[PDB]
Write a protein that binds this ligand. Structure first.
Ligand SMILES: Cc1cc2nc3c(=O)[nH]c(=O)nc-3n(C[C@H](O)[C@H](O)[C@H](O)COP(=O)(O)OP(=O)(O)OC[C@H]3O[C@@H](n4cnc5c(N)ncnc54)[C@H](O)[C@@H]3O)c2cc1C
Ligand SMILES: [Cl-]
Length: 381
């Protein structure tokens, strides 16, 4: 007997922001999740996420990051959970040998972002704790920083519920029935209908979009993150150790200063195990790689951070072939909105994406172009 204006399937990073957008406008909204978000089975746990603005992956990302950033400052104001801490973000790599660093430096120049440029010994003088060869260069964004992604979800959820959004937890959606006039979901806990549907199931999008007759290659990856006891006089946020995303010989790594004395957190970005989200092994340390790829970085470039392993999390990316997101209406149903394929770099945009989703759902359009996220683009395959 339960008919909603909008149903959101998957109330994680994207879905919970979308639900908050909709509920804020008095849209009667049901959010359905396989768990009880924020949880540790998806792509949003491990405590912290980088947001940075000098986004070389495409010009369209730059305004989405800056809008997202403003929206995270707004969410900070609205809630008692902590959202954002402005640690700055350091990008470094070997000079002339890093398309990532080069593209980062261009987007900054091209969008007039405020940034510092440094190189070689300057990097280690500015942040003791960093040890790079004298041939490395860097670009520091002083105004970006670190999101607390689980708090962001919890905040969006509390605020959506306050305005009347319903969240059906521990309920896996199993199928979809889409008419021109409604949408329907089927679950072990019952069926629900609405005018509009947003689909944002994170890694499970790779198995479940076929239920909507779509065939999009989406590869989920096993991505671990470890938290290490650290020299606080070098890696503490309080001494301006930055968040970072850097390129070295064996690939790209990301990480976070120590907050509250808890330990530097680090992740290896360019490698992960190909997995299925239902059979992923979420134990940190089951492959020797989990800890060794991270120590290999630490001992070379951040040796005072290479302490006892305090904790590891196992999390998931869901890549498209072009590593761009998919944000678009279903091509055969204008009442179904798809958010998928965030490719290991979506969380920072999740506030802005929630806004864009809520617009697609309510109007079939959004205020700025979004064509690089087209579900009909050919490089998706
Ligand atoms: C280790 C790691 C570090 C990262 N670091 C960064 C970073 O520093 N900066 C950054 O921008 N991004 C980062 N990312 C990526 C970012 O976290 C993801 O791109 C983003 O969270 C994707 O959000 P989502 O809503 O698609 O998925 P999720 O937040 O996982 O949400 C999808 C939801 O769908 C639910 N669901 C699944 N199946 C069903 C079903 N059948 N029925 C109902 N519900 C279902 C799941 O329970 C889940 O809650 C990182 C990711 C990882 C794994
Ligand atoms: Cl992802």
């Amino acid at each position: 007997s339960t008919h909603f204006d909008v149903i959101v399937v998957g109330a994680g990073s994207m879905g919970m922001a979308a639900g908050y957008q909709l509920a804020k406008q008095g849209v009667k909204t049901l959010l359905v999740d396989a768990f009880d978000p924020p949880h540790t089975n998806g792509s949003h746990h491990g405590d912290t996420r980088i947001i940075r603005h000098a986004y070389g992956e495409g010009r369209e990302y730059v305004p989405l990051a800056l809008r997202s950033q403003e929206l995270w400052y707004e969410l900070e104001k609205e809630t008692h959970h902590k959202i954002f801490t402005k640690t700055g973000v350091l990008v470094f790599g070997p000079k002339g040998e890093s398309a990532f660093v080069a593209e980062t430096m261009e987007a900054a120049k091209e969008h007039s972002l405020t940034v510092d440029l440094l190189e070689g010994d300057e990097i280690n003088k500015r942040w003791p704790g960093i040890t790079v060869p004298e041939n490395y260069n860097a670009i520091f964004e002083p105004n970006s920083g670190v999101l607390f992604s689980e708090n962001c979800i919890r905040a969006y959820r509390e605020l959506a519920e306050a305005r009347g959004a319903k969240v059906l937890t521990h309920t896996r959606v199993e199928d979809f029935d889409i008419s021109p006039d409604s949408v329907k979901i089927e679950t072990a806990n019952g069926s629900y209908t609405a005018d509009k549907l947003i689909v944002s199931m994170g890694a499970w999008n790779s198995k479940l979009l076929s239920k909507l007759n779509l065939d999009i290659p989406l590869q989920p990856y096993r991505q671990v993150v470890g938290f290490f006891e650290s020299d606080e006089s070098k890696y503490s946020n309080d001494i301006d150790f930055p968040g970072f995303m850097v390129e070295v010989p064996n690939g790209i790594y990301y990480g976070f200063p120590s907050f509250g004395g808890c330990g530097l957190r680090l992740g290896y970005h360019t490698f992960g195990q190909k997995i299925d989200p239902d059979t992923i092994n979420r134990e940190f340390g089951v492959y020797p790689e989990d800890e060794s790829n991270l120590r290999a970085f630490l001992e070379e470039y951040m040796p005072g951070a290479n302490g006892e392993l305090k904790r590891g999390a196992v999390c998931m990316y869901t890549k498209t072939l072009d590593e761009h997101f998919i944000i678009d209406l279903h091509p055969e149903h204008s009442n179904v909105v798809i958010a998928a394929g965030f490719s290991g770099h979506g969380f920072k945009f999740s506030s802005g994406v929630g806004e864009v989703l809520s617009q697609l759902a309510l109007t079939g359009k959004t205020e700025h172009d979004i064509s690089i996220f087209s579900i009909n683009r050919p490089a998706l395959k």
